[PDB]
Ligand binder design. Sequence first.
Ligand code: NAG
Lengths: 48, 48
Amino acid sequence: NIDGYFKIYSKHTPINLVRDLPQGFSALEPLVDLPIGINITRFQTLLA
Amino acid sequence: NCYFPLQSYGFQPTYGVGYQPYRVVVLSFELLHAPATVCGPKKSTNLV
Ligand SMILES: *[C@@H]1O[C@H](CO)[C@@H](O)[C@H](O)[C@H]1NC(C)=O
């Protein structure tokens, strides 16, 4: 959140690994940006 | 001296130009405390 602009950058990349966050290099492209204006201080995900 | 507060208007296409009904829009906006999420249209001209 930057002055009420809330921004997302992201990636899906394929891998093949058993355990840990893979070592390596890839960047996240910008996906979306929403002028939500609010004061996020904390957050939670959503499982299904 | 108890009175019900409302008084529904009476409409007749016969009425005087004043007692006739008139629709209103007030384009209200509250200004300049947050990120802008409206603008007027941005013109364009053909490419040389
Ligand atoms: C966001 O938080 C700051 C610090 O508390 C405050 O100045 C600002 O007015 C808040 N804005 C909103 C939309 O609550």
